[PDB]
Amino acid sequence: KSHTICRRCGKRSFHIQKSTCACCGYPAAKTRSYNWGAKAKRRRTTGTGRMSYLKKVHRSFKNGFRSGKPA
Partner RNA sequence: GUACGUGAAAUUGCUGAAAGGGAAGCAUUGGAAAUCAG
Partner RNA sequence: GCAGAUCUUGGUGGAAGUAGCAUUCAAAUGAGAACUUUGAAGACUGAAGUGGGGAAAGGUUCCAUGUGAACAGCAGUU
Partner RNA sequence: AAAACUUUCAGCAACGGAUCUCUUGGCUCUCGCAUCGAUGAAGAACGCAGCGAAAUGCGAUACGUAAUGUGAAUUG
Instruction: State how far the alpha carbon of 36 is from the alpha carbons of 12, 13, 14, 40, 42, in Å.
Output: 22, 19, 22, 9, 12
Residue 21 counted as an annotated binding residue: yes
8 binds RNA (CB under 7 A): yes
Between 29 and 36, name the residue whose CB sits nearer to RNA: 29
Residue 21 binds which entry of RNA, Zn ion, none, CB below 5-8 Å type-dependent: Zn ion
70 binds RNA (CB under 7 A): yes
33 binds RNA (CB under 7 A): no
Query: CB pairs under 8 A, 24+ apart, for 12-21?
Result: none
